[PDB]
Design a protein around this motif. Structure first.
Motif, PDB file in Angstrom:
ATOM      1  N   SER A 127      36.321  39.799  43.942  1.00 26.56           N
ATOM      2  CA  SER A 127      35.134  39.164  43.456  1.00 26.56           C
ATOM      3  C   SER A 127      34.526  38.429  44.880  1.00 26.56           C
ATOM      4  O   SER A 127      35.300  38.058  45.427  1.00 26.56           O
ATOM      5  CB  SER A 127      35.034  38.495  42.365  1.00 26.56           C
ATOM      6  OG  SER A 127      35.931  37.349  42.630  1.00 26.56           O
ATOM      7  N   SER A 128      33.224  38.647  44.905  1.00 31.34           N
ATOM      8  CA  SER A 128      32.411  37.926  45.935  1.00 31.34           C
ATOM      9  C   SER A 128      32.880  38.410  47.488  1.00 31.34           C
ATOM     10  O   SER A 128      33.714  37.488  48.387  1.00 31.34           O
ATOM     11  CB  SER A 128      32.529  36.304  45.999  1.00 31.34           C
ATOM     12  OG  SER A 128      31.875  36.158  44.873  1.00 31.34           O
ATOM     13  N   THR A 139      41.968  38.585  41.086  1.00 30.29           N
ATOM     14  CA  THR A 139      42.567  38.778  39.567  1.00 30.29           C
ATOM     15  C   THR A 139      43.369  40.136  39.564  1.00 30.29           C
ATOM     16  O   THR A 139      42.866  41.332  40.025  1.00 30.29           O
ATOM     17  CB  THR A 139      41.709  38.535  38.746  1.00 30.29           C
ATOM     18  OG1 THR A 139      40.912  39.647  38.362  1.00 30.29           O
ATOM     19  CG2 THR A 139      40.450  37.345  39.104  1.00 30.29           C
ATOM     20  N   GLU A 158      41.053  43.408  40.870  1.00 27.82           N
ATOM     21  CA  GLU A 158      39.746  42.846  41.064  1.00 27.82           C
ATOM     22  C   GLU A 158      39.525  42.124  42.211  1.00 27.82           C
ATOM     23  O   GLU A 158      40.062  40.911  42.387  1.00 27.82           O
ATOM     24  CB  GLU A 158      38.981  42.194  39.857  1.00 27.82           C
ATOM     25  CG  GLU A 158      38.999  42.962  38.399  1.00 27.82           C
ATOM     26  CD  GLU A 158      38.569  44.336  38.321  1.00 27.82           C
ATOM     27  OE1 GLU A 158      39.051  44.958  37.397  1.00 27.82           O
ATOM     28  OE2 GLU A 158      37.945  44.961  39.506  1.00 27.82           O
ATOM     29  N   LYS A 208      37.191  47.188  42.354  1.00 27.66           N
ATOM     30  CA  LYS A 208      38.327  47.715  41.320  1.00 27.66           C
ATOM     31  C   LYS A 208      39.192  48.539  42.163  1.00 27.66           C
ATOM     32  O   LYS A 208      38.827  49.421  42.574  1.00 27.66           O
ATOM     33  CB  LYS A 208      37.981  48.045  40.098  1.00 27.66           C
ATOM     34  CG  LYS A 208      38.975  48.051  39.023  1.00 27.66           C
ATOM     35  CD  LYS A 208      38.529  48.489  37.504  1.00 27.66           C
ATOM     36  CE  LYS A 208      39.307  48.011  36.500  1.00 27.66           C
ATOM     37  NZ  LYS A 208      38.815  48.542  35.086  1.00 27.66           N
ATOM     38  N   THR A 212      29.049  41.671  45.231  1.00 26.04           N
ATOM     39  CA  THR A 212      29.610  42.545  44.059  1.00 26.04           C
ATOM     40  C   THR A 212      31.091  42.238  43.883  1.00 26.04           C
ATOM     41  O   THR A 212      31.790  41.640  44.664  1.00 26.04           O
ATOM     42  CB  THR A 212      28.977  44.036  43.759  1.00 26.04           C
ATOM     43  OG1 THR A 212      29.656  44.356  42.678  1.00 26.04           O
ATOM     44  CG2 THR A 212      29.581  44.870  45.161  1.00 26.04           C
ATOM     45  N   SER A 213      31.777  43.153  43.090  1.00 27.83           N
ATOM     46  CA  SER A 213      33.270  43.007  42.980  1.00 27.83           C
ATOM     47  C   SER A 213      33.722  44.495  43.044  1.00 27.83           C
ATOM     48  O   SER A 213      32.789  45.408  42.981  1.00 27.83           O
ATOM     49  CB  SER A 213      33.701  42.609  41.167  1.00 27.83           C
ATOM     50  OG  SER A 213      33.115  43.341  40.156  1.00 27.83           O
ATOM     51  N   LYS A 261      39.653  34.459  44.374  1.00 25.95           N
ATOM     52  CA  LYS A 261      39.171  35.623  45.083  1.00 25.95           C
ATOM     53  C   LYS A 261      39.698  37.154  44.470  1.00 25.95           C
ATOM     54  O   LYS A 261      39.053  38.039  44.444  1.00 25.95           O
ATOM     55  CB  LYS A 261      39.831  35.527  46.777  1.00 25.95           C
ATOM     56  CG  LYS A 261      39.067  36.625  47.540  1.00 25.95           C
ATOM     57  CD  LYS A 261      37.422  36.584  47.599  1.00 25.95           C
ATOM     58  CE  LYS A 261      36.892  36.897  48.702  1.00 25.95           C
ATOM     59  NZ  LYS A 261      35.652  36.230  49.203  1.00 25.95           N
TER      60      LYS A 261
END
Lengths: 107, 97, 226, 82, 95, 95, 107, 96, 79, 226
Positions: C84-85, C69, C82, C19, C16-17, C67
């Motif tokens: 991600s993965s 953002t 963010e 924050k 998942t991501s 990877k």
DNA sequence: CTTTATTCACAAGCTTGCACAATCCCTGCTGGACAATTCTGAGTGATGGCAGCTCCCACCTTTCCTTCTTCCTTCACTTAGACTACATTTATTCAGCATCTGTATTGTTGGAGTAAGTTCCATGTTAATACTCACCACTGAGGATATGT
DNA sequence: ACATATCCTCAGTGGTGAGTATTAACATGGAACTTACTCCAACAATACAGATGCTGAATAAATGTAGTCTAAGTGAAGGAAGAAGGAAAGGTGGGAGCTGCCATCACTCAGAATTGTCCAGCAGGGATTGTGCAAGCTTGTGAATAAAG
């Protein structure tokens, strides 16, 4: 008798003597102390170095090796401070920053 | 044949003219307009080429910046078409009126 | 005065991501870039990227593109990251740091560091670790790979604490830093000198360049007192 | 003796100036308004430049007079002297 | 026999070769740079002249230039310019 | 204390010349003094710039007339130029 | 010879001598051409007389003998040239012009 | 009882506060705000009464002019209620 | 020290009524408080700089007038 | 450059209303008031009122209050004049004139005037009609009933033509007027002097005061040469 | 559902009381005027040269006019909630008085610092010069866009 | 959801001449050096005005509730603006000549600074009035609510 101009004594490249002469002939005050052109040349040299380095970086991310006024406009308008200093200033042949409002894009 | 939808060419024109740097008005009509305007102040005047050039960059920069302010006024009214009321509002807020 | 608020530790399952916020207060938010770095036991500090809220201009590291953002919210004065993965080697302390748009300026103020737990110029520091008494002089060397025109900074990090800026522009003192610390050097050779030590100098010292596009931190020197 | 030269600022030129300003759609009454606004700005700047020229006892308007006029009206222009 | 014009185009090029060794500059960009240096000079010098006139002083010192830099330039720009001016004055009054 | 000068008696003489029944308050006198000082600074600065542009080291009534033509709007500038020319003519024609 | 002043020579109320002294010591030029203070004083006196006459007219229409800064604001803002001269100028205790937009009225 | 429809007392307030010249913010909260804002620049500094009065006159004049431009933006957006977007647009066109 | 809540809702209402505003949204007041805070910081910083140049510990009306002026917001009636 | 275009003559039935245009060009329209003067062969010229297009500010004479209505349209740069309830004594020539908001300024440029046919302080001019040679001196008095601060103007009108401004502020010459004409006097006593005569000077001369709120013209002198 | 008489509150106008600020008068004192002298900086002329007109021309890129389409603007309905309005409670501000004390301001001295004059030389400007970088020409690949699938 | 012609836009090469980085000639302004002179740090005193506290009367803000009215969403017509094609047309770059005025140089001359005297206009302080604010009463006038048609 010798060498050692006032720019080299202060470790600068901007002319302390010419800035002192322009301060004397510019009708700003009756007297000019001999630390004011040093401070003034240092501030001008720092501002020139900052703008020229940002414009050189803008030229470098353009596969170019020569600064045109477009690079100076890109350097100035991309900075909060710099834009604020030169906010009421028109740069010839500089164009504008490329931006489109988000409501104009199609979806 | 093949036709583009409205706003597609108009967006590529925005992307084209915002990356270019040169003047957008033709040189000779602007020079004639400058001489026509200046003849009402002093007869037989003679400008330099760089004076007309500086006048053209100043006028084009002023018009472009007023067009950004006009576009912001148009978007504030939930529109995408700029109108003379947007120009009047931008010049009113800017202090030009 | 200047605070960089962050969130707590986030336990995250892979796939998942995640924050991370960097709610900023005490300064004009649009005039300073927010830069994100990460810290691991394995490889130390490394710079991930930054986001300029004046024009929302991003710049990422080459190994962190995709990877990570970065986004900004100007109304809430917040910067969001963010990831991600999340793979196995992503359990790290993630720091956000204020840095002015001026090239001389550095990561002067830092966030607390969010601990995420998952279920190029080479910096050469010659002393990996050293011991000192309560009053002697310590010298730390930060010979670099390429040429940086005095764009080096020295940071002090307590254990389980955010790094504290000591030296910017390779010689200038940071705000509130006493005159015991002294930076020197230029070009490729740089050094940090501690004049007389206290009990608060037991810390890890890093040197960071920001002359090139990917910013690289030092290997880190551990300083232990008596 | 020139007359009616504001029409030389054509509709495609105003459209290009709007495209550089970021404008997607343009109404038909924009062009006459833009011609009037450009005219008013031009008489202000040219009047100040001609005053600067007549003080110098010159019959030639120089670029430096235009730069002083622009600086006077708070629209400082870089790259043409000074 | 016409007189000579003077500018900053020689020193600006020296600063450019310091900050970017393999980077040239066009003549139009040098004109922009000359106009920029002249504009900032007149701004700081006029501000410092007003500062000396408000305090009933007859001389412009480096304190007036420092206060004019603080008033004119925005935050971190003014901080680094004050740093540069202080370092140059300290270096000048030592030889 | 220290004898600070103003334009209060001069503005009051002008007021009693154009309205010989109408008084003025202290606050309105402060507004009038600020107005006279501000317009003095504007005209003198424009005349100083006009003298500096043309490589002149003196400020004459021609520089003041050109400055008045620059700062003031149309009929205001025309009547101020008429008043200044009339006063300089009267001063020259009478020692 | 009785020392008559320069303002009475020029037929003015504003001081020629004080304006000459402020022009000399105000760091504007190396020299002052001695007809420049006469012109300056005449222009300042004309502007003061115009503003004071319009303010006295506003006070008379307001049925007041004395001029307050409200009368100066009403005199300045109701004139196009005076408002153009003082566009970026705040008058203390002057208020604003009475102006309601036409859409906001009922019916 | 008697009750005015909305917009009537608002127009009466517009006429009343455009007719007068007195300051609209109370002096003591503005003085405390000025002192706390100046605390970040100086640790212990005093203020003249005239200084706070000049600050209040300038701030109220700036706010009245910005509300004029805000009302113009709201009317241009075919509204009679001013929103924060109108303030942001007016300060964007003004250059603030 | 808070004190931005001292610029109350009816004070901003009165300042909008002087500006000709008929209807006011509920989110206007916080935006106006932020705008007033930014303007006050910008003026007060220059006034304190003018005070510190004079080696004074008191901000005078002259320093405020000079600060205002430098921003293109010339104020009459305070000297 | 400056011109004030007016319409043609009107043949109006009584009891109706008549509109009068004053289309203007050659100057910034909002910065100058437009005054309206009525001219009958029995009462001479009478000032009606003025409109200020900057704030649309009206001011009317007391005898024309309600009977006359002035309006402005800034889009087409036009000034409109409304006459309602036309009494049989309305057969007169109506001029619209430009005048700056400055107190020293006068009605400098006049319109051609529309001839409409229905189907304070008093200026005393001592010579009603006088005869002069080709090279004589002409002196005209304009004794005022009250005091004015030199706010008097001298106008010359040809038969079937608009009046031409000769003298403003009781001494200053108008734009384009030769230096043969010379105004003098102040307070309550004023005079206009024609130095040497031409064949052009066969005209009617008027004096107008604008020092007080109702503007009053003089009776006028008829001057004819050979 | 339509104009229209009570009802109601609000601001404008009129009439004294008065008191705080504006007008005016007295007194030092300092800045402006008188006068002779010098030291210019700026106005008359003359000159050379350069740059800003005016004219001709070929080209080809820009502009203008027509037609079709599309999609954005404007008008009308509806509605839900975000406003205004007002009574009541409360809390904060205004004004006057007193005390205390850091501070702004003035006075005097003298020492560092800065203006002024000579000289001379080293730097900055201009002319002449030989390349370097960017633009045009030309394919070639890569995304974007409208469209029948 | 996909498949596909098709204009448009970067990604590389090569030529090349436009501009620009590099090198003498010289001239001129900045530096060294010394002397005069003056301006502002450095203490010292001293009123003074800003900070702090207290207290009671105004007085504005906060809160809750009702009820209007207005911002915003949806839908639909229509007309105005954009895209594209074809024909006209005028901008643009180049190449001459003509000449007007712009900048330079020398002369010199009236005007502006300089310095000393003194005197009178102007700023500060103190009596002296006076007119605009305050309070109370009356009154026109718009706004909103009930009532007959």
């Amino acid at each position: 008798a010798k060498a050692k101009s006032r720019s080299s004594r202060a470790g600068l490249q901007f002319p302390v003597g010419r800035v002192h002469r322009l301060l004397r002939k510019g009708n700003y005050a009756e007297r000019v102390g001999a630390g004011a052109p040093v401070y003034m040349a240092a501030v001008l040299e720092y501002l020139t170095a900052e703008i020229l380095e940002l414009a050189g970086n803008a030229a470098r991310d353009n596969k170019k090796t020569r600064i045109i006024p477009r690079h100076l406009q890109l350097a100035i308008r991309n900075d909060e401070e710099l834009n604020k200093l030169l906010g009421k200033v028109t740069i010839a042949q500089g164009g504008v920053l490329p931006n489109i409002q988000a409501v104009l894009l199609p979806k | 044949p093949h036709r583009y939808r409205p706003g597609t060419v108009a967006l590529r024109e925005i992307r084209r003219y915002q990356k270019s740097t040169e003047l957008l008005i033709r040189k000779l009509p602007f020079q004639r307009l400058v001489r026509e305007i200046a003849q009402d102040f002093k007869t037989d005047l003679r400008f330099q080429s760089s004076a007309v050039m500086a006048l053209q960059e100043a006028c084009e920069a002023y018009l472009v910046g007023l067009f950004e302010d006009t576009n912001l006024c148009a978007i504030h009214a939930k529109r995408v078409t700029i109108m003379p009321k947007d120009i009047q509002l931008a010049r009113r807020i800017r202090g030009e009126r | 005065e200047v605070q960089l608020q962050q969130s707590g530790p986030e336990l995250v399952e892979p796939g998942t991501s995640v924050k991370m916020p960097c709610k900023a207060s005490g300064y004009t938010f649009t005039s300073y870039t927010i830069q994100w770095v990460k810290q691991t036991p394995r490889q130390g500090l490394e710079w991930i990227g930054y986001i300029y809220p004046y024009n929302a201009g991003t710049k990422y590291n080459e190994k962190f593109k995709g990877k990570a953002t970065l986004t900004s919210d100007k109304s809430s004065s917040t910067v969001y990251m963010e990831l991600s993965s999340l793979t196995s080697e992503d359990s790290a302390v993630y720091y956000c740091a204020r840095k002015s748009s001026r090239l001389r300026s550095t990561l002067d103020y830092w966030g607390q560091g969010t601990s995420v737990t998952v279920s190029d110029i080479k910096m050469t520091q010659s002393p990996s670790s050293m011991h000192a008494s309560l009053g002697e002089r310590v010298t730390i060397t930060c010979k670099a790979s390429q040429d940086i025109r005095s764009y080096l900074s020295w940071y002090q990090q307590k254990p389980w604490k955010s790094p504290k800026t000591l030296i910017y522009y390779a010689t200038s003192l940071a705000d509130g830093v006493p005159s015991r610390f002294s930076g020197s050097g230029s070009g490729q050779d740089f050094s940090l000198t501690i004049n007389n030590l206290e009990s608060d100098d037991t810390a890890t010292y890093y040197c960071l360049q920001h002359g090139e596009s990917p910013y690289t931190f030092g290997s880190g020197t551990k300083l232990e007192i008596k | 003796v020139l007359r009616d030269n504001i029409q030389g600022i054509t509709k495609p030129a105003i459209r290009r100036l709007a495209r550089r300003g970021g404008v997607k759609r343009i109404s038909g009454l924009i062009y006459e308004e833009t011609r009037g606004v450009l005219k008013v700005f031009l008489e202000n700047v040219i009047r100040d430049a001609v005053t600067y020229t007549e003080h110098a006892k010159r019959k030639t308007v120089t670029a430096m007079d235009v730069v002083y006029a622009l600086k006077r009206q708070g629209r400082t222009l870089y790259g043409f002297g000074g | 026999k016409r007189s000579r014009k003077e500018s900053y185009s020689i020193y600006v090029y020296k600063v450019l070769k310091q900050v970017h060794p393999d980077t040239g500059i066009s003549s139009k960009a040098m004109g922009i740079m000359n106009s920029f240096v002249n504009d900032i000079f007149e701004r700081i010098a006029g501000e410092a002249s007003r500062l000396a006139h408000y305090n009933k002083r007859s001389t412009i010192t480096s304190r007036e230039i420092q206060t004019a830099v603080r008033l004119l330039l925005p935050g971190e720009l003014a901080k680094h310019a004050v740093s540069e001016g202080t370092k140059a004055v300290t270096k000048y009054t030592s030889s």
